[PDB]
Amino acid sequence: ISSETGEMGILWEFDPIINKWIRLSMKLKVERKPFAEGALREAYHTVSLGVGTDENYPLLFPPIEMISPISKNNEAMTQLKNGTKFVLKLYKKEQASRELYFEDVKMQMVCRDWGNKFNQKKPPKKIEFLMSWVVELIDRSPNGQPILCSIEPLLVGEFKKNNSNYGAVLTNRSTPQAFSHFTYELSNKQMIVVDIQGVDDLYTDPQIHTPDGKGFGLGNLGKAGINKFITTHKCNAVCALLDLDVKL
Ligand SMILES: Nc1ncnc2c1ncn2[C@@H]1O[C@H](COP(=O)(O)OP(=O)(O)O)[C@@H](O)[C@H]1O
Ligand SMILES: [Zn+2]
Structure with a gap:
């Protein structure tokens, strides 16, 4: 959405309540070096340079029937607005396929619904799962295919x-x-x-x-x-x- 220097991405948000993916674009600026690593992935500090529509990047997985035709509402537009510091996760170089990025993000969304269901029982400590999103890092060179990653808010x-x-x-x-x-x-x-x-x-x-x-x-x-x-x-x-x- 913004003029300043960063790389473009196709941003995907899963919405369990309509059972559809919402396809957007964003610009981000990711640090060159990771700040942490787990077993398979490395985490990178990133700043959002805004969220926009996918209109310039015409469209398959997820299949067309799983994609919302309308993307006006989404969490991304508030949680990833320009200036937001967040976290990008990339597979090291190691197993990962396109389907797995989407499966993993959808999984976190499902867990996020479970968190809400759990909270509705009014436990002593309420819980919450962060949003997670798939990003196609389309500015990065593709053996093919595009570079994918997932992103999520920064935990402090x-x-x-x-x-x-x-x-x-x-x-x-x-x-x-x-x-x-x-x-x-x-x-x-x-x-x-x-x-x-x-x-x-x-x-x-x-x-x-x-x-x-x-x-x-x-x-x-x-x-x-x-x-x-x-x-x-x-x-x-x-x-x-x-x-x-x-x-x-
Ligand atoms: N949202 C976040 N904010 C801050 N740090 C994070 C966040 N998510 C993960 N981390 C850190 O990055 C590490 C690696 O991420 P992880 O999700 O475990 O990758 P893997 O796929 O290898 O399990 C975690 O152990 C944690 O230290
Ligand atoms: Zn028990």
Whole structure:
């Protein structure tokens, strides 16, 4: 949207309530060096140079039927307005495909809905997952295909991982564990949200397991993932406040 120097991107926001992707453009300026790394990805400080429409970049994955024809409303326009400092995540060089960027962002959106459902029970500590978006870094040279990344708001504070996607319980806090338990029981065992991590109860990069192991990226470890969580879960006061069953 802005005149100043930066690179262009195609920005994708998933909206679970209409079950559609919203396609936009933005300009961003990313730092040359990462400020952190995880297992597969590196995180980069980025500044937004504004969000606009995708009109100049005519359009397949996601398929056309999954894309909203209208993009006037979105979180991006406020959360990524010009000046906003945020975080860009790129796969190192290592496995990643186009589909996986979208799966991962949609997954975080699904977890974000679970956070709201959890909060509606009025737990002692309310929780929230950050927005996440797919960005096609179209100014960067494509073996093909385009450079993709995901972006999300900047968390300020000490970043802590509370559980992994395979049974680790990494801190003593109760809410992140009760939340994982809550998603499992309240989904009637259709899914569980783990990899609960972020700053305080602002969370990012969660991971879902489902019994059939289908979808939800490469970190979906299916029944094994679910059972590994069960083996290590001790119900706490939040689990009890939420009236969750001590079995399962
Ligand atoms: N929104 C954020 N704000 C600030 N720091 C973050 C944010 N998201 C991730 N980080 C930091 O970047 C690291 C790597 O990100 P991560 O999502 O774990 O990548 P991977 O795909 O390898 O798991 C995290 O361990 C954390 O230290
Ligand atoms: Zn529990």
